[PDB]
Symmetry: C4
Subunit: 392 residues, 4 copies
Amino acid sequence: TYTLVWKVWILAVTLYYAIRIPLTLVFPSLFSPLLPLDILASLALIADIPLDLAFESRLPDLLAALPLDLLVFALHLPSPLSLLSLVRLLKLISVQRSATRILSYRINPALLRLLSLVGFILLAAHGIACGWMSLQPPSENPAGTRYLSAFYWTITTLTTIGYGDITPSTPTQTVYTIVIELLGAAMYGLVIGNIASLVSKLDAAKLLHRERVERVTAFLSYKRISPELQRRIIEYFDYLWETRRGYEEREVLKELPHPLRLAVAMEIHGDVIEKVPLFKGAGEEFIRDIILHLEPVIYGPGEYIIRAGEMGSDVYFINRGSVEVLSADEKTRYAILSEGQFFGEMALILRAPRTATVRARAFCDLYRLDKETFDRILSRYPEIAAQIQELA
Amino acid sequence: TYTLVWKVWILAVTLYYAIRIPLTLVFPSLFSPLLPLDILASLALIADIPLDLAFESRLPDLLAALPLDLLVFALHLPSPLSLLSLVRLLKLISVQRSATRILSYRINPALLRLLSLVGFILLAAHGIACGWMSLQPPSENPAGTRYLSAFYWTITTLTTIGYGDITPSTPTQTVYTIVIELLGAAMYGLVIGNIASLVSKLDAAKLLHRERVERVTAFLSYKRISPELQRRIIEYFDYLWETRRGYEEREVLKELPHPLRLAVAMEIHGDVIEKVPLFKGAGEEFIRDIILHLEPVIYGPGEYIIRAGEMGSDVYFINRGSVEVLSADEKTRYAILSEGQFFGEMALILRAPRTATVRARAFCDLYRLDKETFDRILSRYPEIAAQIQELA
Amino acid sequence: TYTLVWKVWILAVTLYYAIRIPLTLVFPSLFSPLLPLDILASLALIADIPLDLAFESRLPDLLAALPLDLLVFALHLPSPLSLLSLVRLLKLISVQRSATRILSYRINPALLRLLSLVGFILLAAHGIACGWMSLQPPSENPAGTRYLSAFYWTITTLTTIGYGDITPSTPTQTVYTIVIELLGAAMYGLVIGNIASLVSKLDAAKLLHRERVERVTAFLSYKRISPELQRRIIEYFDYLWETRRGYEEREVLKELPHPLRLAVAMEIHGDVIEKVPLFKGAGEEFIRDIILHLEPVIYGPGEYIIRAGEMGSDVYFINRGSVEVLSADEKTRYAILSEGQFFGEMALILRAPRTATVRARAFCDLYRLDKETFDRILSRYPEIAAQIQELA
Amino acid sequence: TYTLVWKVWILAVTLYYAIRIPLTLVFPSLFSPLLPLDILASLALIADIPLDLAFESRLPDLLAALPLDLLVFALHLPSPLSLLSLVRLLKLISVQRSATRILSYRINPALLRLLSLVGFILLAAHGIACGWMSLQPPSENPAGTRYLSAFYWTITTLTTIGYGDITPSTPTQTVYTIVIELLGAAMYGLVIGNIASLVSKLDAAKLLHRERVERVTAFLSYKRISPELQRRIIEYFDYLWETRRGYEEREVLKELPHPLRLAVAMEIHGDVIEKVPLFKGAGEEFIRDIILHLEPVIYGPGEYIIRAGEMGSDVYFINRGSVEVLSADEKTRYAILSEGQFFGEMALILRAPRTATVRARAFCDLYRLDKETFDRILSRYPEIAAQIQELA
């Protein structure tokens, strides 16, 4: 955090050179009551390269490092030889390459390139305006209203509006006008391309979800499906969008490695698995094996989770919704279960057919565990394998 | 549905302020025979925030809530201090954030952003035209033909045409012209970017299908394949496009959860599975286990589904097409089977070689069931396992 | 193929109306020595709707069907009431919706939308030029050089160049100029958006392949891999691009259904499997089971396919390359094998260690068969299971 | 490498014709003191087609091959018949189709199309400027300042700026101006479309990684997860970006074929597997079977790899990080292990519970081997199966 203020100082110094140098190439009456900031700023640029080595594709800084300027501005070099004082303007490559990585994950990398392009376009419109003001016929004109017309012209040309009120006169103006018309078309094409690349990927999570629903609907209309069930599928996708933004559960935490996925499943199913009267007193490495084999399912409002009279093979842990427990005639309510609790646990040890009917109330988000998977990962731990038989 | 008319009323009130405020900052002769709508509208804006709390990133509404206006327009505040009456124009952020979610799934979210941008561009071209008309040299000119020229100018500049018939004169006009040339280039770049993002994803289902066929064709031309079979593959992809829009069956209903996928398979194979003389009288939880293990295949016209003399291991249920049953010499037709019926059922219980040849007639869309899968999910139900032996 | 010429005739008739109607709304001296084509063309439009029903979102054709025109042009209706003769111009929606599906898979659907947009832009620039020529001050001017200036103006405005040599004069011209400046910006944004969507997906097969190689290279440089092997991987990807255009073998023919995939594998491995002295005389349903379980691998030039002294478990069928067979010291060449033949077959029946070393010569493209897969699908056919034991 | 200089010579000759031919169609005073390069260049073009056949969609070269020119320029053919000397300009299709494949994998194919388009736009702006200079009213004007104004005009029109200082006068100028306004809008739309397609796919690896992290974060905020673990996941994704650029290990080397994947795994795990005292003296075909079944996992700093007292089933090989070995109380350090070494090896032969606790120090990048996979691929090699029992 103490080199960040130095990078900001370097950015300020090179932004100062980018504003000052083409403005003083036109006006010789400057630079003399402003030389001390030249001294401070060239000392800053020559002192940057030891801090560019220590505590920190190298030749832009090396070419901006030397005082190639101050020699033109003292010895009063003529026009086609003065322009090498533009070599300091190569410093912006170094500042660009530093700022494109010191904050390359705070913000969107498309927005960063767009802001950098807008910065370079204004900072280069200043230089083009200074060049246009340079190759004018000299006359008595204050240095505000001869710069303001040149900046008006180089904005009218670069933004391709082209009013045409003030135009080239001489051939040496017309060649400069042709080459910056090419630069204006290039910069404005780059701006439109960056805005197009910025607003194309602007909504991807919300457009991929919209494409998937349109896919499922246009498939199920071919199978001549009922409209009630199709409305229920559409409201399922509305719930799954407005809670977890479209993403499926088991495809998200497949990209985590094993210790992080174990830790996430441990933070989720912590209070849920220290309630059952079968895993009580069991070891830690048994919990960490059953906790990685839970599978998420989502029941809509009014779905039958368990019908009484079915065989029944799985046990359900509730994470988010609520659920209700009914009798075999679906008339007399036994109780109501909410998040943090479980049901259907009397199937891991036993083959018996279900004894109650469990209907959902709202959207549930409940995890389940099979019996085949339970007995498969129960085999290699013989102590719980003998513990469950006395309850069996 | 009674807050929707209130949101429409709020949108109308803030659209009214956006049209009125810069038009009355230029003309002082207004606001006096039009004050009662100011009263009604500021009461609407100050009454919106209790309904913005109850029955409904907060400070735009809070800053648009206070009557910062009417004070400028009564006490006749001068020009650089009057412009704070623009604070009411911050209300459009609230209306934007409400309308971007109350109908965010009726229409395409790209079209919504494009329409919002066109609305803001016209509604801001009005304000820019009022500013241009404000900083004109005053003269005797009716208030229609001095607004019409200003709106003509601010459309010629923002749409980057730039005729150049009426241009800046003073420096204080030229600075305003430079800054709205930048705004015009920005808004027109945003329009081109949104149109490009709208017509890029406009045909995805029809372009992905076209890419897949071009992939398969360019691969099979490398293997030096026959042209007849390649024409048959291309007409298969034409059928699969013009019926179910390219999408494969088993990748679509893999994104549904278990109860919805069960219900869809139940609505499809309802009349198909209550016909066989083996599952008759069998339980409900056996149908719901064989109905999730059917696999779709599609035979073209003239394909051999079953050849007589083969071993034969699977049973086929017809969903959409038609099919014909032939003898072992493929000369004497036995019968014809259409949708809703089945064939090949004498292989689940028996090891016997096929006794007839079944050729397709048109494209079939028929589901099949294996014998290994049948015996695998038949093991855990012993009652049907003993029921099938007496037919075996 | 006899309704195609009728659709071309309908397209010609409505293109004729689109060119003629705004040109005769300006000039009253027309329509009288050109009425017989009006008769023929309105008869064509009113006769299209029975052929639009028989042998073939309906109301554009129904509104273009009636002779709402000829009444204006005979009874000489004035200007704000004549414009309903534009109702015939609604026919272009029907021709658009017909042509967007009768050839929707000959060409790229992006190119079709771009060509349709260019057609509508020229065909609407004609109408806008007729409107501009209509609201001019009348004077003595030939009907060529008053149309040519109007078409020059409506191309200078719509393509956003905007010279500004001929400009609006009256307010009723300026309103028309503002509204078609908006239309010009809209049409030119649509053109840039369609060109951008056309050249973005223009090279996808050649850019996805380039991304995959850059991915593999940037991963393997992290593992600090040798440069020789990395050059060999890059030349492997060059071979796989310049033969089958990047696509992997087993992901392409996974999108075909079972009968087409069976037929493709049958056309490939036809002459290859009627050579081995183990499958000779075996049934057809054994070939059709081993021919679906072959797996493609690709060896580079100089790779060791089989080393003599290894255990050896698989048999290799050559499809495209060539290969050479060497002794155990890799010094004395036995023979050379080319496409259509096989090697390594003495491992399906036997457990014996390999007896020769087989090096590749060029890139091979050879299919292999395992021994576990062979014995797994060999179990259910007992006759070949007893046939192979006497060779075992 | 000796046909590359010939392709460069052909490109130079046709670039010479593209610059010269429309410049000499305007000026008749040329071609006479410059005929020897016509002789050399037409001989080059007619000699290209035998080298286009030997050592190397054909008719552009065949139509550019004949000397259709020199006849116009000698016999002084008039204006509407001279223009067939433009047939030589069809050579650029051949040079385009050669250069689009001789370096089609050095650089990005989007940048190549953009550079080709800029080349054709300048090279066609020259021809359009020559045409504009051709249909001018003739007067006394030097051939520099009558070409410079025409090139200024055809750049002002094609880049859609449109100053409007010099405009059409005659109708035959205005038709030419309309048709090249259409060409200017087309070329500038193509430039904006190619820049948009170039900067849209410019950062894909860095944007896909950013989308995946935003996906995981927005999912885990729904599950109400702890902020400490969420910060640990975000720093895991920062490590995985700044080392191997986001790409997962086992999805990258799944696209290599079997011999290259074997060779890569051999170059990685070479010094790692010749250290264990169990595989010492074992055969080569056992190493090449255990080296393909290693699975990469990544532990963060401070994770528990092995807890002392657990059952323990796997052996870990370290590739990149460092790790520390602690006692059962996590207080007394035993030793420290770095890359190239391994731990946990006393579990392949034995069922015993772990005896030490191994915590990570930094990010590890370590490969592991299971015991089920080890015994599964250990079964088919009986010699090592009996070798491990005496250590068991």
